[PDB]
């Protein structure tokens, strides 16, 4: 389709060949060549940017790929997520978890940090608890029961980092940092462990009479 | 219309021809040519930017189009949304859902991620529930009834990813992550499924006596 | 007025002519020409930017105008709004709705998305409702009465997109997405329809005993 | 004052003249000229920026001034406000409403939108009302009384845009958009009209028993 | 101290002289000169930036100083405040009100707006009042008593701008814009006037029974 | 695999060799060489940026490494954290605490501040207390008991900085700045000390009857 | 260690020497030299930036150091704080108050404001009080008692700036600006004075029956 389009590509090529042959035949004068000549390199230079660089930068990715099709590639910087679909020079298909294919320009991968959880070894499960000041005396023991359970639980990696401590003193709460790592990377398996853990842990704070806490205030009144 | 306008286009062309002929005839001296000559390439170089690059970058889009007229093209980066209308070198018409035609310069597509949900396979329906701590013991069973229903429902894709779990422990709530995918991409059909699902799910939490929850506080008072 | 001003314009012109004639007469030595010569093109190059580019970029706008005097031109990016007044190379007058004339430099139009609602086909009326959880069982029917009315109403375009659904589950509410399009673009006519619609709709939620909702909380107290 | 200062300006000038004369006399060799020569144009080129461009860009302002001494020049972009004081090439004095003279570099005017309300035709008076849901049935009539008054009032321009409508449905309120334009631009006159209008309008909502509204909540309690 | 340091400065100078003399003596071949030669100008060009520009830009400041030692120089843009201490080419000492000397690079003054309140003519005293809706009928008179007092007060400049009006309708309040200018620039004198004014004004709202207002709400409850 | 790929690398190399040999054989004319010639250096120049610079900048890191494999490298600027994994020219592997390997481009290390807590000497434990105004008279003594304990405690470094003071007056509280340093850098050991300290400190405020505080308000009511 | 590494540094040096000797021997043709030649200067030019500039900019710091080892150097701009450790060309060690050594690239010091409180003359102690509207009549006297004490106190510098005034009218409070300067810069001494001052001041507001204030509201209720 489209005459003018197909035409004008021949055109911007042919005249690079014409200037070349004209300064080799006549071009009297030689002087004006170099000059005209420079606007091509400079204008292509400031019209170039990413639109040209995508190909080099894509090739650099071709020498080695930090991400490899079968992985999802969160980036803290730019907002791109979900599994890497297919790799191409001008673009890079990438399915998101909403199954919409975002076409990422390749030059972006040149700059941003590009962690891929797809190559995970583990899933960190991080939580927080938070027990009323009323529960304050019993903090030492409740923490310990929770500390003990995680070791004995099958799902979590005992060898891996496993800290539970009074930690923060924050706000209206007494937040307690659960921090431990699950085995399986895979989504349903880890989530299921997490549910099992919160169900167990939730009971323990219930079990000793320490009560879970919500933001709370101190109203003052007149008579 | 307009003499000065029509005039001044002849002008910036004719003098490119005059410099060319002058350095071929006289121009004595040759030396001053190259020099004058360079301000053209440099000034066009720093007056060029996007205003020149739009055409190259549009052509690059002409070699392949990630978006293809019949689609809407959300971009997480820049704020442009709604169906792609017509494609042009200096611009790109694009109807928004408010039916206002935003004329996007083409150079922008060179940089930003440009997912198009128009080429969706599915609609993810993501929700959250959130049940009082009062409902805490019954969490395991309510979750399961909800877990069971989604599988049996006709609208959702059972084969596709389908997670429901206790997940977060957040705030004054016990948020539960519904996450499943509908069949039809199309707007009224999916929304109707969503309404059917929330109506069903809303009943289940009602049905077991677990109560939906709102932000809550702990007032303290004097006598 | 002003000698020094009028003087110094002659000056920065005349010496471009003097350098030209001096290197054609003497300038011995030729060597130092090219060199001096380059600081002009480079300094004009890095003192140029927008201050020079406004004219090219304005001309590009002269070849075709996405906005055409009789229209108002919101831009999601830069903060400029209101009807386009008059178009000029260094600037572009533009009345705002507060009737203050903002003089927009033309180079800006080169980059930002420039939707103009002035070329609207419709006005989307988007609302939200939000009914207490108390109203929860009756959600299916209230929605339907509202769904029915919009079709029958004369003001809205029935052919055009028209969705009403339970949609969100958010917060302390049960928000319901009204979404439909009015005929007339023009400001008083559409607003009047909107008032008629909200007055009608407001009654319906009132009519079935479902109550409109406001942020709500759950106070807890001591004895 | 200051020998070293006065000295070193002669110095960076004289040696531009020495290099010029040296390559015209000896400079054996010619080759090294051009080279040394280029660091001047390039270093002045990347040490130049705004510090050089202020003068060109100021001159461009001298060809035409969108702002003209007797006016105040808000800019949505950069934070500069208040009456324009005096215009100068390196700077531009500008009194602010706190009577502190901010010296704006001229290059800034090259980029930012520079509306000047000083050349206003009118003052838009925009308000909002907001009536309890309790007042909901009477909304149609209260609006009309308010609608009627503005037309009859002497201060507002009846010919000019004049919309009052139920508009928003927002939050805990029923906000009503007053929007009309005063005659006089000048500060005390318009403000006085505004006071007269709010005093009149405030009564009307009072007059029909509709009550003005404040953020409100729905406390829930135990026994 | 330090041989290697003192040594390596001689070094990067001497070899600029060696290349110059070598291409004037031998350098067979001339061709490679210009080339090597260019990396110096370009690398100094992209290693230059501010680190070189500070001196030019400082000199520009030396031709005229908008700020003059004995003044404090708030900038809306960059965060620098407090009295200007001493002026130097690479830097500019500047005491802050916390008496910590921040060394500002001079190039910054090239770009940012640099108002100096030190050259003030006045101090604007801006306040806000805000009277319960309960006080609403009496707004006209309370405002007037306040309006009258400011004129009669010795401290404020009566000739200078002096507006008091109902202004805003905002929130839970009825905010009233006091706006007037004090005589003395100097810190203790103006503050003392401000205290005298607020003490006087505070009484007037007290005096008519209008009550000052705080954010307020509308609790709703069950039985 | 892939013919076109393997092919096109030969191609962009071979023609650099062809242009070189062609201008050495024919190339008639010499003039057009330099010109064509420049577009290569300029286009590689504006397609280069980081994609080329990563290697130089990586080498600079190779001369000396502020971070050394066995350390974690928080950066206040860019969001990268966790232990440094392996170092490579195009990238730098880096495990995060979630065990996901983020591949950092090396050029980034050139700009951002890169503190590594891995080379810590200590752990600062910073807290805050905050005692009701009710506790106000006893502030001097409670502070002292807390001041005394930290000195006597084995875990904290007494020699190191150790301030405890009334400090802030903020909000509804009387915040007290605990600030002291633990011995062991290592994660479980320090956290355990922190738990021991907060448990001890929590008792002291309890012990004197001063009560810990939460945000509090002053309700006002009608009859 | 590492053959390939050690090898490839020889390599990128040796071929700069080979091109030089080749165009001096053959290089037939001379023409292609200059051209190839330029890609080196340009690519080093756009791969250079900070990675090259760190050394120049470090040297500039070597000519004079605004910060001098024994000082801590807060910067309002970039987030770097704490005592300056050691100074080096590629970097600058700097201990933070958490005793983690952040390695700052030197080029940063070229741009940002770099106040160093280490060279303080004083410590400003700034506070705020805030007394219920209930305390309003007594504001004049309480302020004066506080005004008097600071003069008589030994710790504060009476000669130095010393303002106390009703100042703000803000919010639910009547905030009073204490502002005075302590003698000793050093951390424990000044903090101790601050504690002594707040303890004294706290009593005075207590002493006259004015009560310290917290955010407060006005609940409204039904029957």
Author numbering:
A (entry chain G), B (entry chain F), C (entry chain E), D (entry chain D), E (entry chain C), F (entry chain A), ...: 113 to 335
What does the paper say about this structure?
To understand the molecular mechanism of the Na+/K+-selective characterization of YnaI, we solved its structure at an overall resolution of 3.8 Å (3.6 Å at the cytoplasmic domain) by cryo-EM single-particle method. Similar to previously reported MscS structures, YnaI comprises seven YnaI promoters bearing the MscS channel fold and forming a homoheptamer. The heptamer extends ~117 Å parallel to the sevenfold axis, with ~87 Å in width in the perpendicular direction. Secondary structure analysis predicts that YnaI contains five TM helices, while we only identified two transmembrane helices (TMH4 and TMH5) in each YnaI protomer, which may be due to the flexibility of the other three TMHs. Consistent with other MscS channels, YnaI contains a large cytoplasmic domain and comprises the middle β-domain, α/β domain, and a C-terminal extension forming an interior chamber of about 30 Å in diameter. The isolated C-terminus of β10 in each monomer forms a seven-stranded parallel β-barrel (residues 327–343), leading to the formation of a potential channel pore (referred to as the β-barrel pore hereafter). These structural observations suggest that YnaI structure was resolved at a non-conducting state. Indeed, YnaIM158A in the TM region alters the mean reversal potential from −39.2 ± 0.5 mV to −20 ± 0.5 mV, corresponding to decreased cation-to-anion (PK:PCl) permeability ratio from 9:1 to 3:1. Further simulation and mutagenesis validation supported that seven methionine residues formed a circle and bound anions with different binding energy, leading to elegant modulation of further passing of cations.
Mechanosensitive channel of small conductance (MscS) has an indispensable role in the protection of bacterial cells when the cells experience a transfer from a high osmolarity medium to a low osmolarity environment.
